[PDB]
Design an enzyme around this catalytic site. Structure first.
Site, short mmCIF file in Angstrom:
data_model
loop_
_atom_site.label_atom_id
_atom_site.label_comp_id
_atom_site.label_asym_id
_atom_site.label_seq_id
_atom_site.Cartn_x
_atom_site.Cartn_y
_atom_site.Cartn_z
N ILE A 86 58.07 8.98 2.77
CA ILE A 86 57.06 9.40 1.83
C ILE A 86 56.30 8.18 1.63
CG2 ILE A 86 56.72 10.82 -0.34
CD1 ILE A 86 59.94 11.35 -0.11
N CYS A 87 54.92 8.60 1.86
CA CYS A 87 53.79 7.63 1.27
C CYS A 87 53.46 8.03 -0.06
CB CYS A 87 52.63 7.79 2.28
SG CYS A 87 51.34 6.40 1.90
#
Lengths: 152, 137
Positions: A86-87
């Site tokens: 996840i960014c």
């Protein structure tokens, strides 16, 4: 080298007693820094029919260091990669011991609600989102059906 | 006490390569870029110089099972090689090879690839005849 920090014990307890909406989080019985997480797809999103599985880990220096988290459910989203990574700004540059596990999970939930293909992690998904947004959203809803647990 | 679980250990190993760190002589990444379980990995060993491995590369599969890294991975050469710890019909690295036999949780796939390359460079092994480049098990 010690017992579990009280900070983590209390956060853990409150994730059950005072849960955040649509989110569950509980440690593995044999590793109290390692959490099984679920997040419901937000309503009016392509993910809305599904419940998504995630896993989270608290490094030794938590809360001075951010939790680690990723999706186990396969998911079609420009800011989530094919490994579930996840960014998220709150996990990197904006982390603070003022934030909590529940902060991170809420922020993931909001990311599901507002994909951002212009600052992407999965460039292939972002490209599809940019050139064929309605097709990309349909594919995300299809993958929700294929891979996520169905809401009741 | 304080144990990093399998999946996040595998992420640590993955991100070390992605950040440009690691030895010059071997490398590894995922065999399936979308394997969320990160079970099947692919490694490369550069043959050691001044040997019949010089200027050769060896590709390997590394299977990190559910009890990794408490249990060793399973390692199978793809590239054909003549090396005593490599089964000559299956390419599997034999479990009596020291890194696997004495596997410790601290060991990584990096440890394993470096030890295999060192095995290639011993006086007895560096002179073995090798199969043609491009041959696979």
């Amino acid at each position: 080298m010690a017992s579990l920090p009280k900070r983590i014990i209390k956060e853990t307890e409150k994730l059950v007693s005072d849960p955040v909406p649509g989110i569950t989080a509980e440690p593995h019985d044999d590793n109290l820094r390692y959490f099984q997480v679920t997040i419901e797809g937000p309503e009016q999103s392509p993910y809305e029919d599904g419940i998504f599985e995630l896993e989270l880990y608290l490094p030794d220096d938590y809360p001075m260091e951010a939790p680690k988290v990723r999706f186990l459910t396969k998911i079609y989203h420009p800011n989530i990669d094919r490994l579930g990574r996840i960014c998220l700004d709150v996990l990197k540059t904006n982390w603070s011991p003022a934030l909590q596990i529940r902060t991170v999970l809420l922020s993931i939930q909001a990311l599901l609600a507002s994909p951002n293909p212009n600052d992407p992690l999965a460039n292939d998904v972002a490209e599809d989102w940019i050139k064929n947004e309605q097709g990309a959203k349909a594919k995300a809803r299809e993958w929700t059906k294929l891979y996520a647990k169905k809401k009741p | 006490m304080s144990k990093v679980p399998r999946n996040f250990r595998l992420l640590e190993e993955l991100e070390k390569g992605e950040k440009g760190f690691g030895p010059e002589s071997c490398s590894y990444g995922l065999a399936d870029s979308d394997d969320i379980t990160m079970t099947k990995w692919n490694g490369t060993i550069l043959g050691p110089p001044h040997s019949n491995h010089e200027n050769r590369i060896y590709s390997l599969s590394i299977d990190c099972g559910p009890n990794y890294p408490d249990s060793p991975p399973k390692v199978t050469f793809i590239s054909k090689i003549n090396l005593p710890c490599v089964n000559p019909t299956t390419g599997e690295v034999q479990t009596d090879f020291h890194t696997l036999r004495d596997w410790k949780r601290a060991y990584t796939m990096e440890t394993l690839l470096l030890d295999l390359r060192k095995e290639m460079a011993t006086p007895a092994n560096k002179k073995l005849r090798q199969p043609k480049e491009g041959e696979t098990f």
